[PDB]
Amino acid sequence: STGVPADGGYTVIPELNTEIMRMLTDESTMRRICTVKKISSNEFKQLVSAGGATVNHGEEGKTREQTSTPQINEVSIKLYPVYAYPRTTQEIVDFSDVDILSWLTGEIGDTFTETEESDLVVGDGDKKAKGFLSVPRAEKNDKERDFGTLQVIKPSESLAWTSADPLIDLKFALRKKYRKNAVWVVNSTTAAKLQKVKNANGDYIWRDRLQAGDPDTLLGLPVEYLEFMPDNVIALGDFKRGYYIVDHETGVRTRPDNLTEPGFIKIFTQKYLGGGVVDSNAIKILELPQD
Amino acid sequence: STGVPADGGYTVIPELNTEIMRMLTDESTMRRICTVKKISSNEFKQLVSAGGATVNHGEEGKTREQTSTPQINEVSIKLYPVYAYPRTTQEIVDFSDVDILSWLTGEIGDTFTETEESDLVVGDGDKKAKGFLSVPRAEKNDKERDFGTLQVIKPSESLAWTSADPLIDLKFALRKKYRKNAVWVVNSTTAAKLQKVKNANGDYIWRDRLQAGDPDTLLGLPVEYLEFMPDNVIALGDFKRGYYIVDHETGVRTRPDNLTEPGFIKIFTQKYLGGGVVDSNAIKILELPQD
Amino acid sequence: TVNHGEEGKTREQTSTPQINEVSIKLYPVYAYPRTTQEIVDFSDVDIL
Amino acid sequence: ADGGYTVIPELNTEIMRMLTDESTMRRICTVKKISSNEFKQLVSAGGA
């Protein structure tokens, strides 16, 4: 029996699945909702015209006066090296059936996706991608607010977690231009807190109004959750326009660096991540008081 | 008339439908929601990387420090013989129009599906598949909780059967990684109790919000019910990743064993069932107090 | 049923599943309307 | 933990069998291939 090792138990080898299960794998929602511009430079300058172009509605037989020429703004999204430098022993890389080189590159790529969802959201911008939350916020409309700052809605705790008013405010803070292809961005804990909001009567506001085949939505817009957001913080926008993820044209470049310290192979797999707010009017932030 | 046996009543034979109706037949929801890995071994080792890979967000002109190499975990899913050994009389197997060999193999296959839904859920693991419920549970988040243990949510009886808070907690305990292809797992009695939850006002929380063509869902995710769950226990996860059903490469192997005791044919039809939690972060358990 | 046998244990007898009989008997459901031959002949809408 | 489970031990399929002692007796002694249970060799016991 297999229970006794000596009685034919050593013969039975455990069939190790050669494909290691990468627990932390996820399709990068940042790279899907936001545009990806492969570039070859340290800094990427997208030109974002603020506006100001006007018409005077001229009459038949009136001198056509000068109209104001529209303005342009600079968004200087600088790329920075996001890297991981694990020093695997050459022993494992040789003594293996599950391919440690490919497995570790996959793990570090998943780590890159995680740190993209971290830097492109919360990332302060200190030699890394400046997340839209780290971008300074201003509670003003698109006409009054300065460019490069996001409209933030900050209601009181009363109507914050009791009613849909903050989220409706967040939805219609966006213009139709962005609401056509907008998407919600909520933390999982903040999402749970949102689904639990109950008015003075007691009924839920967001009454799980979905079908089986429906993707998770909120006020008629899809919700791509980002796990690295701070608690009780929400975002919403046309992140295709709203945010630029500037990857370098080389992308992930995994030199194994086997000669630096023999007996060890050190996968470097550095990538150049950049991120920035583009069309600051295309993303809206909603801060909610902590319960 | 047919009423009197002698007056042409013996001529009328009852047309026995040669296809026996197997009452207990059901498409195995376990084998569909969970992955099936046909294997040739006593033990199946899937490698489940816990994580821990990090990046330091290096600057331009800074020495690139060492990052922590990610970890791997072992899930030792051992296969065990699940069998049934019915001793049919050779008399019936010969004296029959409905094929008793095929009918009995179908009945024992349905029994195997039932005992899969039992072992892969509640099964303690004593020389059988260890169900995800029998796997030890811990009320902690994915970061703090030990691997190989499932996040269990245990609210008080007040908000358990009055509000959707436990189920929303269960939904967003999963990460987006799993919520993309997640599925609910509820007992039929527990499902009925869930559909009956009514807040302090009296209105139902889950207001049968479905269409005719919609599969039964809950918080925007499908619900594949398992009948062998304990009362007032719920599960939810990406069971493709969350649970591994390790069948042996031979599968069901039905030797009829006609020589062991003549006058009797003893279908053995043993299979090697194994089951285990894989990505303990991909399944979430919700315990609710008994009413 | 299954006994969930171990490695190195005698495989005990499991209970053979049962069968039930549902004797669905057919019976004559009929209607015997006596239409006049007059209408069946004198008609444009086909009475038959 | 960190890549040690990765290392499967390469177990050899063909098990080496203990080398037995060359079947000495049936080389030495005379071997008979009978179709019965008994072989009965009549021998001269002397006494003449």
PDB file of all heavy atoms in Angstrom, chain C residues 2-24:
ATOM      1  N   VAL C   2     -21.224   5.256  -1.178  1.00  0.00           N
ATOM      2  CA  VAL C   2     -19.810   4.909  -1.224  1.00  0.00           C
ATOM      3  C   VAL C   2     -19.267   4.982   0.196  1.00  0.00           C
ATOM      4  O   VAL C   2     -19.752   5.753   1.030  1.00  0.00           O
ATOM      5  CB  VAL C   2     -18.997   5.831  -2.160  1.00  0.00           C
ATOM      6  CG1 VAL C   2     -19.568   5.808  -3.570  1.00  0.00           C
ATOM      7  CG2 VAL C   2     -18.939   7.241  -1.614  1.00  0.00           C
ATOM      8  N   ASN C   3     -18.259   4.157   0.477  1.00  0.00           N
ATOM      9  CA  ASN C   3     -17.696   4.075   1.819  1.00  0.00           C
ATOM     10  C   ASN C   3     -16.395   4.851   1.979  1.00  0.00           C
ATOM     11  O   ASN C   3     -15.872   4.918   3.098  1.00  0.00           O
ATOM     12  CB  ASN C   3     -17.475   2.608   2.210  1.00  0.00           C
ATOM     13  CG  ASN C   3     -18.779   1.835   2.281  1.00  0.00           C
ATOM     14  OD1 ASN C   3     -19.860   2.416   2.151  1.00  0.00           O
ATOM     15  ND2 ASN C   3     -18.692   0.527   2.483  1.00  0.00           N
ATOM     16  N   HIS C   4     -15.871   5.447   0.904  1.00  0.00           N
ATOM     17  CA  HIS C   4     -14.638   6.236   0.943  1.00  0.00           C
ATOM     18  C   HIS C   4     -13.486   5.406   1.519  1.00  0.00           C
ATOM     19  O   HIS C   4     -12.932   5.695   2.583  1.00  0.00           O
ATOM     20  CB  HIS C   4     -14.848   7.528   1.745  1.00  0.00           C
ATOM     21  CG  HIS C   4     -16.087   8.276   1.360  1.00  0.00           C
ATOM     22  ND1 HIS C   4     -17.285   8.126   2.026  1.00  0.00           N
ATOM     23  CD2 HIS C   4     -16.314   9.176   0.375  1.00  0.00           C
ATOM     24  CE1 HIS C   4     -18.195   8.905   1.467  1.00  0.00           C
ATOM     25  NE2 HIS C   4     -17.631   9.552   0.464  1.00  0.00           N
ATOM     26  N   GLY C   5     -13.151   4.350   0.782  1.00  0.00           N
ATOM     27  CA  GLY C   5     -12.170   3.400   1.263  1.00  0.00           C
ATOM     28  C   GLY C   5     -10.777   3.991   1.371  1.00  0.00           C
ATOM     29  O   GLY C   5     -10.421   4.955   0.693  1.00  0.00           O
ATOM     30  N   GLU C   6      -9.979   3.391   2.248  1.00  0.00           N
ATOM     31  CA  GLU C   6      -8.608   3.803   2.498  1.00  0.00           C
ATOM     32  C   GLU C   6      -7.638   2.923   1.715  1.00  0.00           C
ATOM     33  O   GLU C   6      -8.014   1.913   1.115  1.00  0.00           O
ATOM     34  CB  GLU C   6      -8.292   3.735   3.996  1.00  0.00           C
ATOM     35  CG  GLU C   6      -9.073   4.720   4.854  1.00  0.00           C
ATOM     36  CD  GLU C   6     -10.441   4.202   5.256  1.00  0.00           C
ATOM     37  OE1 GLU C   6     -11.280   3.974   4.361  1.00  0.00           O
ATOM     38  OE2 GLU C   6     -10.678   4.024   6.469  1.00  0.00           O
ATOM     39  N   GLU C   7      -6.369   3.324   1.729  1.00  0.00           N
ATOM     40  CA  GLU C   7      -5.299   2.537   1.120  1.00  0.00           C
ATOM     41  C   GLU C   7      -4.912   1.432   2.094  1.00  0.00           C
ATOM     42  O   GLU C   7      -4.240   1.679   3.100  1.00  0.00           O
ATOM     43  CB  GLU C   7      -4.100   3.416   0.779  1.00  0.00           C
ATOM     44  CG  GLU C   7      -2.975   2.673   0.068  1.00  0.00           C
ATOM     45  CD  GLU C   7      -1.828   3.580  -0.339  1.00  0.00           C
ATOM     46  OE1 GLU C   7      -1.219   4.211   0.551  1.00  0.00           O
ATOM     47  OE2 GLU C   7      -1.529   3.659  -1.550  1.00  0.00           O
ATOM     48  N   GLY C   8      -5.335   0.205   1.798  1.00  0.00           N
ATOM     49  CA  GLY C   8      -5.049  -0.919   2.664  1.00  0.00           C
ATOM     50  C   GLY C   8      -6.189  -1.249   3.605  1.00  0.00           C
ATOM     51  O   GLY C   8      -5.963  -1.575   4.776  1.00  0.00           O
ATOM     52  N   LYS C   9      -7.419  -1.165   3.106  1.00  0.00           N
ATOM     53  CA  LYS C   9      -8.599  -1.525   3.877  1.00  0.00           C
ATOM     54  C   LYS C   9      -9.524  -2.352   3.001  1.00  0.00           C
ATOM     55  O   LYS C   9      -9.677  -2.069   1.809  1.00  0.00           O
ATOM     56  CB  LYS C   9      -9.337  -0.284   4.400  1.00  0.00           C
ATOM     57  CG  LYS C   9     -10.444  -0.600   5.393  1.00  0.00           C
ATOM     58  CD  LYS C   9     -11.333   0.608   5.644  1.00  0.00           C
ATOM     59  CE  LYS C   9     -12.213   0.904   4.442  1.00  0.00           C
ATOM     60  NZ  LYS C   9     -13.196   1.988   4.725  1.00  0.00           N
ATOM     61  N   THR C  10     -10.135  -3.376   3.593  1.00  0.00           N
ATOM     62  CA  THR C  10     -11.065  -4.219   2.856  1.00  0.00           C
ATOM     63  C   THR C  10     -12.273  -3.399   2.422  1.00  0.00           C
ATOM     64  O   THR C  10     -12.871  -2.679   3.226  1.00  0.00           O
ATOM     65  CB  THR C  10     -11.506  -5.404   3.714  1.00  0.00           C
ATOM     66  OG1 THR C  10     -10.354  -6.144   4.140  1.00  0.00           O
ATOM     67  CG2 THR C  10     -12.423  -6.323   2.922  1.00  0.00           C
ATOM     68  N   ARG C  11     -12.632  -3.512   1.145  1.00  0.00           N
ATOM     69  CA  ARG C  11     -13.695  -2.697   0.569  1.00  0.00           C
ATOM     70  C   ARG C  11     -15.040  -3.345   0.872  1.00  0.00           C
ATOM     71  O   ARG C  11     -15.399  -4.363   0.271  1.00  0.00           O
ATOM     72  CB  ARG C  11     -13.471  -2.530  -0.930  1.00  0.00           C
ATOM     73  CG  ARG C  11     -12.096  -1.971  -1.254  1.00  0.00           C
ATOM     74  CD  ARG C  11     -11.878  -0.640  -0.540  1.00  0.00           C
ATOM     75  NE  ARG C  11     -10.483  -0.212  -0.550  1.00  0.00           N
ATOM     76  CZ  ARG C  11      -9.811   0.162  -1.630  1.00  0.00           C
ATOM     77  NH1 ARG C  11     -10.381   0.197  -2.823  1.00  0.00           N
ATOM     78  NH2 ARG C  11      -8.534   0.515  -1.508  1.00  0.00           N
ATOM     79  N   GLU C  12     -15.785  -2.750   1.799  1.00  0.00           N
ATOM     80  CA  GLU C  12     -17.037  -3.314   2.273  1.00  0.00           C
ATOM     81  C   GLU C  12     -18.146  -3.132   1.237  1.00  0.00           C
ATOM     82  O   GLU C  12     -18.034  -2.351   0.289  1.00  0.00           O
ATOM     83  CB  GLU C  12     -17.435  -2.678   3.604  1.00  0.00           C
ATOM     84  CG  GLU C  12     -16.424  -2.897   4.719  1.00  0.00           C
ATOM     85  CD  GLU C  12     -16.856  -2.273   6.031  1.00  0.00           C
ATOM     86  OE1 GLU C  12     -17.925  -2.658   6.551  1.00  0.00           O
ATOM     87  OE2 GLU C  12     -16.125  -1.401   6.547  1.00  0.00           O
ATOM     88  N   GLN C  13     -19.232  -3.874   1.437  1.00  0.00           N
ATOM     89  CA  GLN C  13     -20.360  -3.839   0.518  1.00  0.00           C
ATOM     90  C   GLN C  13     -21.135  -2.536   0.663  1.00  0.00           C
ATOM     91  O   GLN C  13     -21.443  -2.103   1.778  1.00  0.00           O
ATOM     92  CB  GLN C  13     -21.281  -5.030   0.779  1.00  0.00           C
ATOM     93  CG  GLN C  13     -22.373  -5.227  -0.260  1.00  0.00           C
ATOM     94  CD  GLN C  13     -23.439  -6.201   0.205  1.00  0.00           C
ATOM     95  OE1 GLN C  13     -23.144  -7.345   0.551  1.00  0.00           O
ATOM     96  NE2 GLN C  13     -24.688  -5.750   0.219  1.00  0.00           N
ATOM     97  N   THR C  14     -21.448  -1.910  -0.468  1.00  0.00           N
ATOM     98  CA  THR C  14     -22.301  -0.732  -0.491  1.00  0.00           C
ATOM     99  C   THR C  14     -23.722  -1.127  -0.868  1.00  0.00           C
ATOM    100  O   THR C  14     -23.950  -2.142  -1.532  1.00  0.00           O
ATOM    101  CB  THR C  14     -21.770   0.310  -1.477  1.00  0.00           C
ATOM    102  OG1 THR C  14     -21.671  -0.270  -2.783  1.00  0.00           O
ATOM    103  CG2 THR C  14     -20.401   0.808  -1.041  1.00  0.00           C
ATOM    104  N   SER C  15     -24.681  -0.311  -0.438  1.00  0.00           N
ATOM    105  CA  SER C  15     -26.084  -0.624  -0.669  1.00  0.00           C
ATOM    106  C   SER C  15     -26.443  -0.418  -2.136  1.00  0.00           C
ATOM    107  O   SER C  15     -26.164   0.636  -2.716  1.00  0.00           O
ATOM    108  CB  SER C  15     -26.974   0.237   0.225  1.00  0.00           C
ATOM    109  OG  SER C  15     -26.706   1.615   0.037  1.00  0.00           O
ATOM    110  N   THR C  16     -27.062  -1.431  -2.732  1.00  0.00           N
ATOM    111  CA  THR C  16     -27.483  -1.344  -4.121  1.00  0.00           C
ATOM    112  C   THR C  16     -28.686  -0.410  -4.243  1.00  0.00           C
ATOM    113  O   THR C  16     -29.644  -0.529  -3.472  1.00  0.00           O
ATOM    114  CB  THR C  16     -27.831  -2.737  -4.651  1.00  0.00           C
ATOM    115  OG1 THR C  16     -26.759  -3.641  -4.351  1.00  0.00           O
ATOM    116  CG2 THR C  16     -28.052  -2.712  -6.155  1.00  0.00           C
ATOM    117  N   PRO C  17     -28.666   0.528  -5.189  1.00  0.00           N
ATOM    118  CA  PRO C  17     -29.775   1.480  -5.299  1.00  0.00           C
ATOM    119  C   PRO C  17     -31.079   0.812  -5.714  1.00  0.00           C
ATOM    120  O   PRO C  17     -31.093  -0.238  -6.359  1.00  0.00           O
ATOM    121  CB  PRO C  17     -29.290   2.467  -6.368  1.00  0.00           C
ATOM    122  CG  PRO C  17     -28.348   1.675  -7.204  1.00  0.00           C
ATOM    123  CD  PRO C  17     -27.665   0.721  -6.254  1.00  0.00           C
ATOM    124  N   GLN C  18     -32.180   1.439  -5.323  1.00  0.00           N
ATOM    125  CA  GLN C  18     -33.522   0.924  -5.547  1.00  0.00           C
ATOM    126  C   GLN C  18     -34.134   1.495  -6.827  1.00  0.00           C
ATOM    127  O   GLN C  18     -33.640   2.466  -7.401  1.00  0.00           O
ATOM    128  CB  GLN C  18     -34.415   1.242  -4.344  1.00  0.00           C
ATOM    129  CG  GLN C  18     -34.061   0.489  -3.059  1.00  0.00           C
ATOM    130  CD  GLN C  18     -34.422  -0.982  -3.141  1.00  0.00           C
ATOM    131  OE1 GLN C  18     -34.987  -1.433  -4.135  1.00  0.00           O
ATOM    132  NE2 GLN C  18     -34.100  -1.739  -2.091  1.00  0.00           N
ATOM    133  N   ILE C  19     -35.221   0.859  -7.273  1.00  0.00           N
ATOM    134  CA  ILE C  19     -35.996   1.296  -8.429  1.00  0.00           C
ATOM    135  C   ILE C  19     -37.464   1.335  -8.031  1.00  0.00           C
ATOM    136  O   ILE C  19     -37.925   0.527  -7.220  1.00  0.00           O
ATOM    137  CB  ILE C  19     -35.781   0.373  -9.658  1.00  0.00           C
ATOM    138  CG1 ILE C  19     -34.361   0.501 -10.198  1.00  0.00           C
ATOM    139  CG2 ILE C  19     -36.761   0.686 -10.771  1.00  0.00           C
ATOM    140  CD1 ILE C  19     -34.063  -0.434 -11.356  1.00  0.00           C
ATOM    141  N   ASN C  20     -38.200   2.289  -8.598  1.00  0.00           N
ATOM    142  CA  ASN C  20     -39.634   2.393  -8.384  1.00  0.00           C
ATOM    143  C   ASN C  20     -40.383   2.300  -9.706  1.00  0.00           C
ATOM    144  O   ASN C  20     -39.861   2.629 -10.778  1.00  0.00           O
ATOM    145  CB  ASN C  20     -40.017   3.701  -7.686  1.00  0.00           C
ATOM    146  CG  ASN C  20     -39.284   3.906  -6.382  1.00  0.00           C
ATOM    147  OD1 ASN C  20     -38.722   4.972  -6.143  1.00  0.00           O
ATOM    148  ND2 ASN C  20     -39.281   2.886  -5.532  1.00  0.00           N
ATOM    149  N   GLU C  21     -41.633   1.861  -9.594  1.00  0.00           N
ATOM    150  CA  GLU C  21     -42.534   1.663 -10.719  1.00  0.00           C
ATOM    151  C   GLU C  21     -43.575   2.774 -10.750  1.00  0.00           C
ATOM    152  O   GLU C  21     -44.240   3.033  -9.742  1.00  0.00           O
ATOM    153  CB  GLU C  21     -43.228   0.306 -10.597  1.00  0.00           C
ATOM    154  CG  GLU C  21     -44.222  -0.012 -11.690  1.00  0.00           C
ATOM    155  CD  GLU C  21     -44.934  -1.323 -11.431  1.00  0.00           C
ATOM    156  OE1 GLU C  21     -44.535  -2.040 -10.490  1.00  0.00           O
ATOM    157  OE2 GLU C  21     -45.907  -1.624 -12.148  1.00  0.00           O
ATOM    158  N   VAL C  22     -43.718   3.421 -11.903  1.00  0.00           N
ATOM    159  CA  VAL C  22     -44.800   4.371 -12.141  1.00  0.00           C
ATOM    160  C   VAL C  22     -45.641   3.797 -13.277  1.00  0.00           C
ATOM    161  O   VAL C  22     -45.232   3.798 -14.444  1.00  0.00           O
ATOM    162  CB  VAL C  22     -44.293   5.787 -12.452  1.00  0.00           C
ATOM    163  CG1 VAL C  22     -43.799   6.452 -11.180  1.00  0.00           C
ATOM    164  CG2 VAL C  22     -43.175   5.763 -13.479  1.00  0.00           C
ATOM    165  N   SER C  23     -46.818   3.276 -12.931  1.00  0.00           N
ATOM    166  CA  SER C  23     -47.681   2.583 -13.887  1.00  0.00           C
ATOM    167  C   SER C  23     -48.685   3.579 -14.459  1.00  0.00           C
ATOM    168  O   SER C  23     -49.788   3.771 -13.941  1.00  0.00           O
ATOM    169  CB  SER C  23     -48.376   1.407 -13.213  1.00  0.00           C
ATOM    170  OG  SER C  23     -49.067   1.823 -12.047  1.00  0.00           O
ATOM    171  N   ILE C  24     -48.288   4.230 -15.548  1.00  0.00           N
ATOM    172  CA  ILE C  24     -49.138   5.231 -16.180  1.00  0.00           C
ATOM    173  C   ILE C  24     -50.003   4.541 -17.227  1.00  0.00           C
ATOM    174  O   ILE C  24     -49.509   4.122 -18.277  1.00  0.00           O
ATOM    175  CB  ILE C  24     -48.297   6.349 -16.806  1.00  0.00           C
ATOM    176  CG1 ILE C  24     -47.419   7.004 -15.741  1.00  0.00           C
ATOM    177  CG2 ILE C  24     -49.195   7.376 -17.468  1.00  0.00           C
ATOM    178  CD1 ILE C  24     -46.463   8.028 -16.289  1.00  0.00           C
TER     179      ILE C  24
END
